[PDB]
Amino acid sequence: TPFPQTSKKIGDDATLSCNRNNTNDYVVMSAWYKEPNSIILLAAKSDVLYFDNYTKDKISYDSPYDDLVTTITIKSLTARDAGTYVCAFFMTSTTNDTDKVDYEEYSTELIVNT
Amino acid sequence: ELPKRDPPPGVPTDEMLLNVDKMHDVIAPAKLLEYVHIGPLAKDKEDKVKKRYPEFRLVNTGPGGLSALLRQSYAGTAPNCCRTFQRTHYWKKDGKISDKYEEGAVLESCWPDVHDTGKCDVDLFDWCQGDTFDRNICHQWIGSAFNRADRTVEGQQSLINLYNKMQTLCSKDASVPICESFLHHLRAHNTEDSKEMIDYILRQQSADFKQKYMRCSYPTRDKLEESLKYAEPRECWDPECSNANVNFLLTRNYNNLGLCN
Amino acid sequence: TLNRIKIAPGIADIRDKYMELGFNYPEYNRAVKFAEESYTYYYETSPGEIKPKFCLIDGMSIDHCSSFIVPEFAKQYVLIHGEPCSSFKFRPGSLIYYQNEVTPEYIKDLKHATDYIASGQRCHFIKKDYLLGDSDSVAKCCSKTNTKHCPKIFNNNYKTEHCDDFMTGFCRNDPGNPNCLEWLRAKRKPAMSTYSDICSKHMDARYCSEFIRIIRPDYFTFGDTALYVFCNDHKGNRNCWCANYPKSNSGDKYLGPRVCWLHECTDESRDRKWLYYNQDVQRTRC
Amino acid sequence: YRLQGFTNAGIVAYKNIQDDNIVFSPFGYSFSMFMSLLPASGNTRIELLKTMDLRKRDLGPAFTELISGLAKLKTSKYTYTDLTYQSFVDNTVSIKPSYYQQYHRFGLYRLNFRRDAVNKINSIVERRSGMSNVVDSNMLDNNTLWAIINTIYFKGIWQYPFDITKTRNASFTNKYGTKTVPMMNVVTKLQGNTITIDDEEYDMVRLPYKDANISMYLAIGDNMTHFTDSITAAKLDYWSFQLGNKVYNLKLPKFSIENKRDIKSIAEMMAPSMFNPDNASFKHMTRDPLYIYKMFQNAKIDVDEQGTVAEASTIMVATARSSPEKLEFNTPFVFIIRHDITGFILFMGKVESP
Numbered sequence A: 001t002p003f004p005q006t007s008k009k010i011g012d013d014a015t016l017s018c019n020r021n022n023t024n025d026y027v028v029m030s031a032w033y034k035e036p037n038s039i040i041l042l043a044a045k046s047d048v049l050y051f052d053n054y055t056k057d058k059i060s061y062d063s064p065y066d067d068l069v070t071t072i073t074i075k076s077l078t079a080r081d082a083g084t085y086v087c088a089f090f091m092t093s094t095t096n097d098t099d100k101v102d103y104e105e106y107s108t109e110l111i112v113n114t
Numbered sequence B: 001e002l003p004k005r006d007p008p009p010g011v012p013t014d015e016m017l018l019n020v021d022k023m024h025d026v027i028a029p030a031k032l033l034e035y036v037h038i039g040p041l042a043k044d045k046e047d048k049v050k051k052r053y054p055e056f057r058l059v060n061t062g063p064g065g066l067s068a069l070l071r072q073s074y075a076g077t078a079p080n081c082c083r084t085f086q087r088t089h090y091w092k093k094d095g096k097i098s099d100k101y102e103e104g105a106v107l108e109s110c111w112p113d114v115h116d117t118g119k120c121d122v123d124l125f126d127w128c129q130g131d132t133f134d135r136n137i138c139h140q141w142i143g144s145a146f147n148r149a150d151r152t153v154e155g156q157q158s159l160i161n162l163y164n165k166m167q168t169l170c171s172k173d174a175s176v177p178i179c180e181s182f183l184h185h186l187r188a189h190n191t192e193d194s195k196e197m198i199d200y201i202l203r204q205q206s207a208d209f210k211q212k213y214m215r216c217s218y219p220t221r222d223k224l225e226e227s228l229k230y231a232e233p234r235e236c237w238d239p240e241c242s243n244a245n246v247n248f249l250l251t252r253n254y255n256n257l258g259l260c261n
Numbered sequence C: 001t002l003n004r005i006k007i008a009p010g011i012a013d014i015r016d017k018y019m020e021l022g023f024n025y026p027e028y029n030r031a032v033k034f035a036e037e038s039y040t041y042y043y044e045t046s047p048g049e050i051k052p053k054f055c056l057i058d059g060m061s062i063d064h065c066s067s068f069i070v071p072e073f074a075k076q077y078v079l080i081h082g083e084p085c086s087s088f089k090f091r092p093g094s095l096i097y098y099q100n101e102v103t104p105e106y107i108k109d110l111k112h113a114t115d116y117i118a119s120g121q122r123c124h125f126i127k128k129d130y131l132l133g134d135s136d137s138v139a140k141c142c143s144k145t146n147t148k149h150c151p152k153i154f155n156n157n158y159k160t161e162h163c164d165d166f167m168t169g170f171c172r173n174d175p176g177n178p179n180c181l182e183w184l185r186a187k188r189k190p191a192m193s194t195y196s197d198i199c200s201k202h203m204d205a206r207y208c209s210e211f212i213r214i215i216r217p218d219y220f221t222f223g224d225t226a227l228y229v230f231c232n233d234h235k236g237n238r239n240c241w242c243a244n245y246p247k248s249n250s251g252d253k254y255l256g257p258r259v260c261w262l263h264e265c266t267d268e269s270r271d272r273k274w275l276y277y278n279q280d281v282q283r284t285r286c
Numbered sequence D: 001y002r003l004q005g006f007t008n009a010g011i012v013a014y015k016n017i018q019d020d021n022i023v024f025s026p027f028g029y030s031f032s033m034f035m036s037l038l039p040a041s042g043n044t045r046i047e048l049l050k051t052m053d054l055r056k057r058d059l060g061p062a063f064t065e066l067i068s069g070l071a072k073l074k075t076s077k078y079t080y081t082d083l084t085y086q087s088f089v090d091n092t093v094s095i096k097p098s099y100y101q102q103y104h105r106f107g108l109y110r111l112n113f114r115r116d117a118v119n120k121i122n123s124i125v126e127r128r129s130g131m132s133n134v135v136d137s138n139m140l141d142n143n144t145l146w147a148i149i150n151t152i153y154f155k156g157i158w159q160y161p162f163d164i165t166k167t168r169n170a171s172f173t174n175k176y177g178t179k180t181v182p183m184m185n186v187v188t189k190l191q192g193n194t195i196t197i198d199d200e201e202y203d204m205v206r207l208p209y210k211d212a213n214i215s216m217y218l219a220i221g222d223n224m225t226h227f228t229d230s231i232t233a234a235k236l237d238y239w240s241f242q243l244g245n246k247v248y249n250l251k252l253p254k255f256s257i258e259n260k261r262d263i264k265s266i267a268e269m270m271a272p273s274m275f276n277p278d279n280a281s282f283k284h285m286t287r288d289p290l291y292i293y294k295m296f297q298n299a300k301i302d303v304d305e306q307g308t309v310a311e312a313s314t315i316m317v318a319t320a321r322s323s324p325e326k327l328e329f330n331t332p333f334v335f336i337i338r339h340d341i342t343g344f345i346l347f348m349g350k351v352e353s354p
């Protein structure tokens, strides 16, 4: 498991970030899910869409200007909030006109305990 | 043939009336992956801003050169950072470190509570082993013995490795001052029953330690019989061991021998 | 080229306007929907964002669209890249909405033909916290002299590490500030060391009593080091001589259970700041 | 990076509806057509890229525009629009590993259509949204191996509340003996004018929603099949531009309409290969030849004295039931629900009361 395993305490704003390997291709989609299926939030440039039961009050999006890094900060951490977070990059190539997309998924273990 | 309209005059806010120069008490204290904001920067000065801040990377926040500095590293060297608890950050200049900003000095910050994450247990162990031990720092360095709340795979491994590595030295010869601070902290630092150095090497020590570092606690056979005689005249440190400070007392011998009210 | 430069004001909003731009050819005649700005934005266009209908032409100062926000309200909004804007050079600040027959392809064709259209990007302001960019102000509002116009990262009752370095020296200058004690309550190593040094130099003040009260259950080492250093310089002190470096006999004895039977001092503890951990916690059960 | 053709596709789909009691959601139809591009490939991909004016390079920035528009639509608590999407693929279908690694969290679900093919789909849709009885037992068969569902919910509290007072109206034109519909009257300042589409007068007024950049545009005139045929995004923008503020004494009915519509033809002319089993090249999803049989739209709209509640469901299934096609009514008015910033059109149709 080369992915980092970050640990924090309850109430501390945990910051989880990803850097896309392919910086040349236009970023169409940033995504943050919790395994196995639930989707936490969706990001397109500066705009953010919330799925399931999630709002800006609970989990924020403090990377609106930077595209090379996607970052989520979770405030008021809870043992329920502790889990494995999947962070997804969807690029398309704007150089030519093709149908192939680029997908980059990175996992990160967020462990919260007293 | 053209309806012209001059744009309204621009009122500049605080978000644009800045320069990274003369902003150093805001850039230096920061955390990882946080966008602390500096004013617009020209393309020529950016390199300088990059050189002064190696842990920071310039990110093009907005138009007109509006950029922020994102911290992705903590380049804190052990012989400078953990040697002094005061230094949250230091500055290099002409090959010398300092605690005050200067023109051209390169910033180097430190991990938060770096002694709580165990980055320095390797270097601090080999620095103040003797002849340079500081009663301030290397005594507070053992505050982590019960304050390590890292709860991380690397951190716990570092803590256990440090425990064993220093237990080797405290087994060879207790007279090391760092080991003295260790047995000072060992009263309740790790739960209440995690101390057994009594029977490993401290069970059989040199005869000089009988007369120099454990006087009435580790006695000879005749003194062993005399110690328990009467009603605790040699139990705890009444007779002559009271003059000797309570530095190296066996933990089992501590509660047992030293319990005089 | 352009023959019909007709304008059409918006009955719904004076800002939104139309241009019935007719040209030399019947192919090039367009009802371009362009909207200027005359409002002053004391509110939010979208939650957390302000998007004035002004959009800077490439090669213009960022100040022009910072005016449309009241200076009091614009103390928190940072300008970033927005969606690309097409404008009218003759009337700068124009925002050409793409609709119906007019398209960015046609916009690019018109730009190539003549200089009536200028590129740029929409002014996108996002609300972050206040911005602290002057060395005096970071020293000011972390010390709580002016609890205004600075980010909560420096104004969270010292819940973070963003103003520990300066206030180490600030508290070295004067430990009497209650905000200094509030910062010390944050339980941070720089505060630990600076207060240990201050107490070692000056334990006589009451600033050390609350410090040792705060730190003792968690960290022993800083308090013990300060107590050891302070007594060395002032050995004959009327209160230091209990259970410390200057006892009656040679060396420094009575460090541990020997303090349990002590009655002349360390019974009605006037100030537990003169004693280490062993001299108090074990003392209570003795 | 535009969605003008995206909305124009739904507008065209609404135009071809030949009915008098119409309640249609262009946004749902456009969403289905636009987001069926992910499993599309080859001929069907170019057909779906031609129906909405989106070149191959512009694919992906258009998705940023769509998601940003969805976020902007969900920016308030008094009014909000929810958009949900689900897909169901037969277990005998072996979807591509890359497609599953990419879009399996965006509503993909696996089940065989031979056993209990409807109740599970209904439960899933009711879990992920607020629509129930969306799928009936006659809508899926053993042949079917693929199902698609899209759902739109709009709730908007009026910016200017409609005072509740006793008023009713009656109609006597035809098709009914006597029918009474509740009415109300409010005096308030609103933006409404008298514009001509093509030498035809029309009174059009905009009703806003509280804490929302959404509006409901009402047009009243004599021959409004002409008005329906003359609907574009540009025309609606022009009408909003021209309609200006004045004091109005507006009388409106508290109408509630339900609609079910077959979209097969009107979603079929521009995408012939999406329904033909011999040309449906959906290779980004699976290698096997999978095609789409039929599609159906269910719409509900309620206009009250406090706000509007609208629901829509677009379904891609095998077959379904039919709906009446001849419900004639006189003196109606056209309503259009439009977000001013994004330019999306969510619901439009006609009424029967006035």
Ligand SMILES: *[C@@H]1O[C@H](CO)[C@@H](O[C@@H]2O[C@H](CO)[C@@H](O[C@@H]3O[C@H](CO[C@H]4O[C@H](CO)[C@@H](O)[C@H](O)[C@@H]4O)[C@@H](O)[C@H](O)[C@@H]3O)[C@H](O)[C@H]2NC(C)=O)[C@H](O)[C@H]1NC(C)=O
Binding pocket: C042, C043, C044, C045, C046, C047, D210, D211, D212, D213, D341
């Ligand atoms: C989308 O529509 C939304 C409709 O609510 C807009 O968001 C809201 O917009 C208002 C202003 O239109 C924001 O500002 C508040 O508005 C009033 C100010 O009006 C009062 O004072 C003026 C005189 O100054 C007077 O004429 C009025 O009658 C009122 O007495 C006050 O409530 C507040 O002080 C505040 O300024 C709202 O904050 C805002 N709501 C939010 C953000 O939730 C939004 O602008 C529209 N988007 C557009 C047009 O792009």
Ligand SMILES: *[C@@H]1O[C@H](CO[C@@H]2O[C@@H](C)[C@@H](O)[C@@H](O)[C@@H]2O)[C@@H](O[C@@H]2O[C@H](CO)[C@@H](O[C@@H]3O[C@H](CO)[C@@H](O)[C@H](O)[C@@H]3O)[C@H](O)[C@H]2NC(C)=O)[C@H](O)[C@H]1NC(C)=O
Binding pocket: D223, D224, D225, D226, D229
């Ligand atoms: C409401 O208005 C529509 C459309 O408006 C009509 O068409 C314009 C181009 C002008 O001619 C307007 O004056 C006119 O109102 C009416 O539908 C249209 O009706 C006309 C007249 O019957 C139809 O024209 C016929 O069409 C075919 C050939 O295309 C032949 O039968 C005839 O030669 C004749 O040209 C026209 O097709 C039709 N358009 C449709 C159905 O989309 C509509 O009747 C009117 N309603 C009422 C109640 O008057």
Ligand SMILES: *[C@@H]1O[C@H](CO)[C@@H](O[C@@H]2O[C@H](CO)[C@@H](O)[C@H](O)[C@H]2NC(C)=O)[C@H](O)[C@H]1NC(C)=O
Binding pocket: A021, A022
């Ligand atoms: C991440 O990107 C790097 C940099 O492009 C990739 O490393 C190169 O990948 C190419 C792929 O054609 C290889 O030809 C090179 O030999 C690679 N170089 C090195 C130094 O490894 C890398 O493969 C990408 N992916 C990952 C998972 O790291």
Ligand SMILES: *[C@@H]1O[C@H](CO)[C@@H](O)[C@H](O)[C@H]1NC(C)=O
Binding pocket: A095, A096, A097
């Ligand atoms: C994309 O198209 C460009 C056109 O210049 C071409 O140079 C490049 O090789 C293409 N890339 C791929 C992966 O086909």
